[PDB]
Write a protein that binds this ligand. Structure first.
Ligand SMILES: [Mg+2]
Lengths: 705, 664, 604
């Protein structure tokens, strides 16, 4: 409120109101509304007593006509009133007056109110009487004057306009409603507690208090001095952090069960094939076409594989029906190759049972469930405990290598005029040079496009079965653009308005890897032998990996956001370069990547062979980082998040050990158990545990030297 | 191990760990001693003269001005009328409407104090009438409003009840947890108490004003430098990277009631009572339990969900072992209506500032027994970092042990599995890693650089502003920002089917874009939404592309795009122009189709239509809106009649209608 | 259109809920009523937009002659439709129609567009005309400061800007022009001239003017120029490990000089407070009293803070001591009188502080943390900005600490005065004595072993980056950011112009103003424009004798003294009288005060 008074009232009015409040022993800060009311009263009084003088004849015109008595100390105002009364031979009012009119030789009382002017006028007359004249103005453009000739039109209009402006300003600041009139100004903000809330308060106090009043008195009066020290002395000594100095010997391999050869090898569970993927390539002029037409054309080019109608089953996983999956695949091919333009499957009834949609339980009302003694709660399914698999390392090796085909294309940005955007452009050029052609980029683009198509078709259709090609656009060094078809998918009954229920997807994906070479990697895939190809004049078998999977709209959305891997893979590198650019003035991007006259190219330890670590260029580390991010996306679930979060602590402890910071651990087995509880069946988590153990051994050896 | 009793108000089973036995093991303990908490708060007051009084006065003054509509801000709130989760505005207006049926007209008074007074009063009414959604099968399921009633006890249970769900998208945790939302009865009081706590904690140097952006780096660097400077000659400074998990389950609302009472030691009793209501309603809270369990028989291929009110209607032998044990242990605190009383502990996100104040109070002890070590640290919302300066590692570990034990006395538990220690100079706080003066905050996921999905112009402005803000705050480098621009432009072109006119893409809009590509001579002036080339770079991320391309626009293209009277713009679609992005009005400024609600909607729409100023600034007046509407309509009709914009019959009809309203 | 307004008003009045809400709810409460919406905003906005853009007709087209100019279909694409609607009774349209309109359509007139959006075009003009330099890739020392994000045509508090925008865009609803319209009469008239002839929606213009007038400030790390021109481009100039040179293509200094002159004039005369306030509220800067821009900015220069304290205004609670900006961190200090012998051999009775205390200290471009106990300096940690700032900060912190070593280190004399010729307190005399002779207490202060650590490095008495630093002085190669939790707590004013806290502690000092002269860039003066609805005064109630109300142009036709019926704000029918003169409430109140005081003096 004080801001309002300062903005709308001069310092003199505020000082006078504060003095008046002090005379009555009223604190203006504790009662701001009363101070504001006094300020308004003073302002209106002084405004009324202006521009009015008495000529020699004694008539009003524009010696002053009005003499102000309000605003001065009580004693001085009383002296003024008594002197005026004695001089003019008029009866001295028993109550102090506000103004004095010489023309009428009378005492005038000025008042303000929020209600009707007449009511306040009557109240003031009753309180004081007719010994003094009564002018009353109200905030609602109404007033009551005992004599209408005392104030001309101009004065009353001016005071009314000022009051209206103040009212509007208060309403804007949400203070008018909070503001209370002089009748209620001698009060506060009333907030009484009821009965139920009072009882709830009474029954919500700590032990040792019978009611809330006792708690209030205790907190207000008693001072605690040594309560913490008093309680620590009598606390049992078993309550302790139990600190223990960390040493390289204390650190031990995480998840030793991953070396237990009795456990099954980790199976491949990614949504799509990544390193074993095969893509039928169709060269095109670059025109963008609907995915159905692209798939139709790619299949038409490879007519031998499309027309293959006699499957040669290679291995059926455990329960998948070979007939169901093969008939579903043939339906997919026929739908893609049909003259129509809709991608919906033409059976819609065989596909109901081929995908397993028809094998769903039937909901029943809760009463029958209560009465049926054989309806129990299914026990939780615990993820299998598996051991390290040799295919995750192979995938890491293969995905982080340059290929002849790049699927990463990005829009353009405005020209660069500042040097900063020039250095940014150079950094981007180097990054995309070392990331455009790596296979992880093609896999990421394929995943992104497939998930976009999945989400779009889920929105478009829910209760029918649709065909979605696994498609990519791939440009090679010469600038030729190929459309790559990696298979097809049947998206089934997506009766899923939410984002946390399963949508079935049967994926049939081309591949050239023999499933018999690594039988332990594909126990979830029913794979057929659909034909053979001549990639470069040499024959290569073409198998078809079939698998029934599930997704959620949230999973499709977050798959659409795999491209952020690129960002994650550049920020990192940028930071590295920045650090070097900080060590030496000039920009170190050129020096970091390929070196310069006075700086050799940067190298990073990438892997090992026969127990000896191997170094590689900055580009190789870049590709490794990008593949790491891509794998984090592909194999991301609760297990991976937990493992990464819990192993970050061990990584920081190892960093502290390296720098000789003398780290301590309050308990180490708890941290190890927290980390190891997440190593159950996620291929990336298990391979990461293996890699962490290997790196920890190398770090221990380095510490020895 | 505390005190178990029965709540007479509600009949629930209440547990009171406060002032209980001291812990004898290293398991989490809620047995916070009141005297120790008061000791910590008194120390905090001593080190900060008049901070409690200043915060209390500021909170009171802000409360006096706050209005009921302030409760419309926030997230989904529990609605007792429907016992569901509904937006804040929906719950607030439903409660205001149902309070009118009960003769509780505090909402019409404006300010928040009268509305909260009526909320408190509603707990006393012997019954409680409201409007409930009832579905009739007429076959169509038609929902409608029905005047339903609930006795006092059920209403109290609903008001104290806290709806629950499973937290979603909580990265870094293997298992999930329970997140909760409260109703409107506790929203205002929680708001005031949180304002008080924030006022206190902004001054505290340990917590600091809740820092955003790169102020976290400054806080970490200042803390490390200050502690290292304070380190005695030849001594050692050790930093403990700490982490409390499920630390809100050992925080008692009774302790927070004590803190609110201590903080407001010198304040009017009305504000002291007002600030004491959120802890009171949190100490007697009721936890609604999910949606039940699902039981299936596979020999019959049948499944059925068991609603939580009927959890124990089935023999426990028909649940799995973990659920069996859970229900067996839950039985004592199970309520017949399908809820469980949860007196001790606190759900996440309710009292964050207050809990931070408690943590900073724990930090500010700084020593125990005049030992040879000084500890100080940073605290923020369950995450703390400690620093101990002493003369040797043994004394530093003694100080860390003393801090652990002291925190045990306040109900604060620190995870020994998640907490570690090392020499000062390398640690982590709020997922921000400091090492040798270098801070490496890398846990804030960069938001997906895609269109905000409001409209073309606004989306482009929002995306560019977001990239620039990331550069300014989150230390985004040049190249990363340029790649972010590229990705955003790709997503923008994909969403709005706006590819370069020279591209070979096909589509409904792309045909017209291709036509415009050649019909327009100046090609670099087109907006990207019209197939134009992107010209955004690091330097010009703060200038709208409408302005950026104004000089290169063709004479007719700017006129068409900037045609003052074009059909793709409506006044009522401008509400969201502010919320902040800078853009321009044009053909790309359209809005989306719409997928006592309609009463208020249409009344306010008419109010804004009659007076275009009400949309921008709050109107001022001390009279009904109806009379002002009538008067302004009379003035408008007279002006139109004078200017020839209206006929005699039209003005006569307008006056007849106004008289029908009753303002002639 | 008003025909449809009345028709829809009657339709709403048909149901009783509308009748009860309209009459029960006032104009003021409408804001709350606005927020009781559906709150059904989309959860997945981007995905919903992607799905909608594929729908046939997702755009809500308007009804009018221009809208009908769009073909029903174009070369197969169905741009629009004539189908009826139930959700909004409107027409739907396709984005292809927007593309067609931007390709084939009626060319509008664009002449006032630049004037309306002149702020963005000024931004682009600043960018285009700027010149760039070189990049420094070494680490940069950034400082956290409150900065203004974008330039403003004029800086006002939010209320003043809102009033100004109301005055410009909406000629109606302008009752009782406040004490802000004639202040910005030139701005109002120029805005009206620029915005005339434009058909743009009023709300867009209101928000644009709000952006252009209301100051947007934020705490940002800056290194070098802090003007909003550089801050707008901060994303490109600055970096954690790089820096760039950029050259982009007033009332503040005048206010500073005026406040300093007022302080100097007041201090010399007895009872400085009354004279200072009289000059302050009698001062004007070319269009307005001092209480027109003093409220615009929060705090500011020390002289401005003192003047604001003398007036009724809020200021920041940061402590000022000479050139030192101090923000207390923790602890209670007790100021007790004590007799201490100075190194010169004289004995002085001064107030010493008892109790450990800590401060975030700033001076020029140097920031640090100072922890001091009673009559002693415990520790001082500083960054590295510049030699002069380092020396000044060290000297001022040593002086503030009141260490016994400083008292023993006095070798000359303390009898100096100010430009006005006044004897100062011993603290400021010692400050000046040590500032004049920097190498006086440093020699006898003592040296300490260098801060052996990774980054904490010592600074010698010569301010060079060398070991063997001063006792307690440490230089950290880090960033110290301070001055948080700005509460603007209540501040009292003493007759001597020295500000104090709620208790007796003193924050600001009269001599904290630097005795520097800058003349003044503006015209300091000591003692058709204005706004619409300025020549009329509210008088009475509706008074239906006049029937309907009248417009501003109709109102001007009336001769002075005639009664008129007007609608004030959102309605509020009132009766007004055409003012025969020009009013000034401040003048009337001053005349009343003069009459009262002269009455009292004459009686005395
Ligand atoms: Mg932590």
């Amino acid at each position: 409120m004080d801001t309002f008074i300062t903005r709308n009232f001069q310092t003199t009015i505020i000082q006078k109101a504060k003095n008046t409040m002090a005379e009555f022993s009223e604190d203006p800060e504790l009662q701001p509304a009363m101070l504001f009311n006094i300020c308004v009263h003073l302002e209106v009084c002084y405004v009324i007593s202006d521009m009015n003088f008495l000529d020699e004849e004694g008539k009003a015109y524009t010696r002053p006509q009005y003499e102000v008595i309000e605003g001065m100390p009580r004693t001085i105002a009383w002296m003024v009133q008594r002197s005026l009364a004695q001089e003019h031979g008029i009866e001295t009012p028993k109550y102090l007056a506000d103004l004095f009119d010489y023309k009428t030789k009378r005492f005038i009382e000025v008042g303000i109110t929020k209600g009707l002017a007449d009511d306040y006028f009557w109240k003031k007359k009753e309180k004081l009487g007719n010994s003094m004249e009564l002018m009353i103005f109200s905030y609602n453009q109404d007033y009551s004057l005992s004599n209408e000739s005392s104030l001309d039109e101009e004065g009353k209009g001016r005071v009314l306009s000022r009051l209206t402006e103040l009212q509007a300003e208060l309403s804007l600041k949400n203070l008018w409603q909070v503001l209370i009139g002089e009748e209620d100004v001698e009060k506060g903000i009333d907030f009484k507690l009821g009965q139920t809330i009072s009882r709830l308060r009474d029954i919500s106090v700590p032990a040792g208090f019978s009611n809330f009043e006792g708690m209030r008195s205790y907190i207000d009066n008693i001072d605690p001095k040594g309560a913490i020290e008093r309680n620590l002395a009598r606390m049992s000594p078993l309550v302790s952090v139990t600190p223990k100095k960390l040493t390289w010997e204390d650190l031990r391999p995480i998840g030793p069960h991953i070396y237990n050869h009795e456990l099954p090898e980790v199976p491949y569970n990614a949504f799509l094939l990544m390193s074993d993927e095969l893509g039928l390539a169709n060269m095109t002029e670059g025109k963008s076409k609907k995915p159905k037409t692209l798939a139709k054309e790619c299949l038409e080019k490879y007519s031998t594989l499309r027309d293959q109608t006699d499957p040669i089953l290679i291995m059926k996983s455990e329960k998948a029906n070979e007939n169901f999956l093969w008939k579903l695949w043939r339906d997919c091919v026929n739908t893609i190759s049909n003259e129509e333009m809709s991608n919906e499957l033409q059976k819609t009834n065989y596909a109901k049972w081929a995908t397993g949609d028809g094998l769903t339980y039937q909901k029943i009302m809760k009463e029958v469930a209560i009465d049926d003694e054989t309806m129990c709660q299914e026990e939780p399914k615990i993820p299998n405990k598996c051991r390290v698999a040799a295919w995750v390392q192979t995938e890491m090796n293969l995905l982080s290598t340059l290929t002849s085909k790049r699927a990463l294309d990005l829009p353009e940005i405005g020209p660069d005029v500042a040097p900063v955007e020039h250095v940014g452009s150079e950094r981007r050029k180097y990054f995309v040079n070392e990331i455009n052609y790596c296979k992880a980029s093609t896999v990421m683009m394929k995943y992104v496009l497939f998930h976009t198509s999945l989400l779009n078709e889920s929105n478009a259709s829910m209760g029918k079965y649709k065909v979605i090609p696994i498609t990519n656009r791939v440009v090679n060094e010469k600038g030729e653009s190929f459309d790559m078809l990696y298979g097809l998918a049947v998206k089934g009954q997506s009766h899923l308005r939410g984002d946390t229920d399963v949508v079935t997807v049967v994926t049939f994906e081309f591949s050239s890897t023999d499933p018999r070479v690594d039988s332990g990697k594909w126990p979830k895939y029913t794979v057929f032998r659909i034909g053979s190809l001549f990639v470069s004049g040499r024959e290569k078998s073409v198998y078809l990996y079939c698998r029934v999977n599930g997704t959620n709209k949230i999973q499709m959305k977050w798959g659409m956001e795999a491209r952020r891997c690129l960002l994650q893979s550049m920020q990192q590198m940028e930071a590295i370069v920045e650090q070097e650019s900080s060590i030496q003035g000039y920009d170190m991007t050129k020096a970091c990547f390929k070196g310069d006259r006075v700086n050799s190219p940067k190298t990073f330890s990438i892997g090992t062979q026969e127990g000896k670590l191997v170094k590689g260029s900055f580009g190789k580390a870049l590709r490794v980082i990008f593949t790491k991010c891509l794998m984090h996306y592909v194999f991301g679930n609760a297990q991976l998040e937990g493992f990464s979060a819990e192993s970050r602590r061990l990584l920081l402890l190892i960093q502290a050990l390296k720098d000789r910071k003398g780290p301590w651990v309050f308990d180490l087995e708890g941290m190890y158990s927290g980390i190891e509880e997440c190593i159950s069946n996620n291929p990336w988590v298990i391979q990461s545990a293996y890699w962490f153990n290997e790196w920890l051994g190398f770090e221990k050896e380095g510490s020895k030297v | 191990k505390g005190k178990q009793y029965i709540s007479d108000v509600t009949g629930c089973t209440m547990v009171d760990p406060t002032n209980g036995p001291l812990p004898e093991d290293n398991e989490p303990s809620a047995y916070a001693q009141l005297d120790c908490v008061l000791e910590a708060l008194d120390r905090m007051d001593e080190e900060h003269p008049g901070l409690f009084q200043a915060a209390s006065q500021n909170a009171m003054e802000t409360l006096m001005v706050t209005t009921v509509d302030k409760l419309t801000q926030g997230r989904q709130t529990f609605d007792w009328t429907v016992c569901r989760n509904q937006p804040a505005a929906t719950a607030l207006n439903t409660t205001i409407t149902s309070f009118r049926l009960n003769d509780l007209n505090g909402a019409d008074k404006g300010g928040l104090i009268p509305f909260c007074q009526d909320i408190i009063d509603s707990l006393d009414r012997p019954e409680m009438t409201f409007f409930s959604v009832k579905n009739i099968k007429k076959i169509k399921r038609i929902p409608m409003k029905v005047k339903d009633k609930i006795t006092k006890v059920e209403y109290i249970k609903r008001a104290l009840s806290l709806n629950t769900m499973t937290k979603d998208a909580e990265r870094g945790k293997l298992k999930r947890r329970a997140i909760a939302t409260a109703g409107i009865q506790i929203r205002g009081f929680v708001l005031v108490v949180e304002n008080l706590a924030k006022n206190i904690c902004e001054n505290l140097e340990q917590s600091g004003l809740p820092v955003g952006g790169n102020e976290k780096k400054a806080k970490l660097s200042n803390a490390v430098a200050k502690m290292l400077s304070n380190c005695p000659p030849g001594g050692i400074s050790m930093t403990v990277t700490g982490d409390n998990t499920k630390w809100n389950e050992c925080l008692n609302p009774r302790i927070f009631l004590a803190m609110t009472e201590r903080i407001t030691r010198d304040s009017p009793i009305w504000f002291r009572d007002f600030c004491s209501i959120a802890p009171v309603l949190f100490s007697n809270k009721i936890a609604r339990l999910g949606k039940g369990f699902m039981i299936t028989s596979k020999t019959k291929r049948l499944k059925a969900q068991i609603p939580c009110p009927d959890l124990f209607s089935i023999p426990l032998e028909r649940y799995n072992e973990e659920t069996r044990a859970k229900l067996k242990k839950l039985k004592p605190f199970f309520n017949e209506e399908g809820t469980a009383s949860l007196s001790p502990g606190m759900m996440m996100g309710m009292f964050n500032m207050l809990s931070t104040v408690l943590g900073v109070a724990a930090l500010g002890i700084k020593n125990i027994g005049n030992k040879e070590y000084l500890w100080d640290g940073l605290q923020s919302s369950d995450d703390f970092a400690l620093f101990v300066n002493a003369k040797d590692e043994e004394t530093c570990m003694e100080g860390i042990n003393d801090f652990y034990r002291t925190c045990k006395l306040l109900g604060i538990n620190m995870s020994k599995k998640k907490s570690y220690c090392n020499e000062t100079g390398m640690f982590e706080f709020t997922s921000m890693f400091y090492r040798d003066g270098f801070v490496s905050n890398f846990a804030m996921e960069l938001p997906s650089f895609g269109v905000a999905g409001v409209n073309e112009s606004a989306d482009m402005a929002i995306g560019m502003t977001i990239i620039k803000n990331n550069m300014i705050n989150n230390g985004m480098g040049p190249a990363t920002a340029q790649t972010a621009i590229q990705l955003f432009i790709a997503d923008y072109r994909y969403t709005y089917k706006c590819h370069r006119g020279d591209s070979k893409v096909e589509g409904k809009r792309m045909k017209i874009i291709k036509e415009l590509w050649e019909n327009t001579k100046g090609r670099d002036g087109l907006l990207v939404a019209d197939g134009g080339p992107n010209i955004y770079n690091l330097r010009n991320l703060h200038i709208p592309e409408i302005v950026l391309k104004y000089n290169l626009m063709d004479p007719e293209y700017k006129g068409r795009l900037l045609h003052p009277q074009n059909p793709f713009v409506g006044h009522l679609s401008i509400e969201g122009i502010k919320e902040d992005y800078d853009a321009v009005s044009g053909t790309h400024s359209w809005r989306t189709k719409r997928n006592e609600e309609q009463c208020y909607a249409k009344c306010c729409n008419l109010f804004e239509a009659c007076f275009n100023s009400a949309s921008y600034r709050k109107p001022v007046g001390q009279h009904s809106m109806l009379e002002a509407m009538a008067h302004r309509l009379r003035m408008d009709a007279r002006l139109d009649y004078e200017s020839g914009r209206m006929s005699k019959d039209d003005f006569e009809k307008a006056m007849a209608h106004l008289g029908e309203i009753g303002y002639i | 259109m008003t025909l449809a307004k009345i028709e829809l008003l009657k339709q709403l009045l048909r149901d009783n809920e509308a009748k009860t809400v309209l009459k029960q709810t006032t104009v003021d409460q409408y804001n709350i009523i606005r927020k009781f919406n559906t709150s059904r905003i989309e959860k997945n906005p981007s995905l919903r937009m992607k799905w909608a853009m594929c729908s046939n007709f997702p755009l809500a087209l308007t009804k009018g002659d221009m809208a009908n100019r769009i073909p029903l279909e174009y070369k197969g694409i169905q741009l629009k439709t004539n189908a009826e609607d139930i959700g909004t009774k409107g027409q739907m349209c396709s984005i292809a129609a927007v593309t067609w309109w931007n390709t084939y359509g009626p060319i509008g007139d664009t002449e006032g567009f630049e004037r309306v959006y002149e702020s963005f075009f000024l931004r682009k003009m600043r960018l285009d005309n700027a010149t760039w330099g070189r990049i420094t890739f070494g680490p940069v020392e950034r400082v956290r400061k409150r900065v203004l994000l974008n330039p403003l045509t004029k800086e006002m508090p939010p209320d003043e800007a809102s009033n100004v925008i109301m005055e410009i865009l909406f000629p109606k609803e302008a009752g009782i022009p406040r004490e802000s319209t004639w202040i910005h009469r030139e701005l109002i008239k120029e805005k009206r001239e620029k915005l005339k002839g434009t058909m743009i929606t009023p709300i867009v213009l209101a928000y644009m003017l709000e952006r252009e007038l209301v100051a947007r400030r934020r705490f940002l790390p800056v290194a070098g120029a802090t003007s909003a021109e550089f801050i707008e481009m901060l994303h490109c100039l600055q970096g954690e490990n790089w820096r760039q040179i950029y050259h982009p293509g007033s009332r503040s200094q005048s206010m500073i000089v005026a406040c300093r002159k007022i302080i100097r004039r007041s201090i010399v005369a007895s009872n400085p407070l009354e004279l200072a306030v009289e000059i302050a509220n009698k001062t004007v800067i070319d269009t307005e009293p001092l209480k027109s821009c003093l409220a615009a900015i929060d705090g500011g220069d020390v002289a401005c803070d003192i003047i604001r304290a003398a007036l009724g205004l809020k200021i920041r609670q940061r402590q000022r001591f000479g050139r030192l900006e101090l923000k207390r961190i923790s602890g209670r200090g007790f100021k007790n009188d004590e007799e201490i012998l100075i190194g010169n051999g004289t004995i002085q009775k001064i107030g010493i502080w008892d109790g450990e205390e800590e401060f975030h200290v700033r001076c020029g471009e140097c920031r640090g943390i100072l922890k001091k106990s009673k009559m002693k300096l415990e520790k001082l940690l500083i960054n590295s900005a510049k030699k002069e700032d380092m020396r000044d900060l060290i000297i001022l912190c040593m002086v503030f600490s009141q260490d016994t070593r400083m008292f023993q280190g006095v070798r000359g004399e303390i009898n100096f005065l100010n430009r006005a010729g006044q004897l100062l307190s011993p603290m400021y005399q010692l400050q000046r004595y040590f500032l004049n002779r920097s190498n006086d207490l440093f020699d006898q202060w003592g040296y300490e072993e260098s801060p052996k650590a990774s980054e904490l490095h010592g600074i010698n008495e010569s301010m060079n980056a060398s070991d063997y630093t001063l006792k307690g002085v440490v230089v950290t190669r880090n960033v110290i950011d301070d001055f948080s939790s700005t509460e603007t707590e209540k501040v009292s004013i003493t007759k001597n112009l020295s500000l104090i806290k709620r208790t007796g502690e003193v924050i600001m000092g009269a001599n904290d103003v630097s005795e520097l002269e800058s003349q003044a860039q503006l015209m300091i003066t000591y003692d058709m424009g204005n706004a619409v609805l300025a020549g009329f005064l509210v008088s009475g109630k509706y008074d239906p004798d006049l029937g309907d109300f009248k417009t501003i142009e109709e109102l001007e036709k009336l001769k002075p003294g005639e009664k008129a019926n007007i609608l004030l704000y959102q309605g509020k029918p009132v009766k007004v009288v055409k003012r025969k003169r020009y009013s000034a409430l401040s003048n009337d109140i001053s005349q009343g005060i003069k009459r009262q005081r002269m009455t009292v003096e004459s009686m005395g």
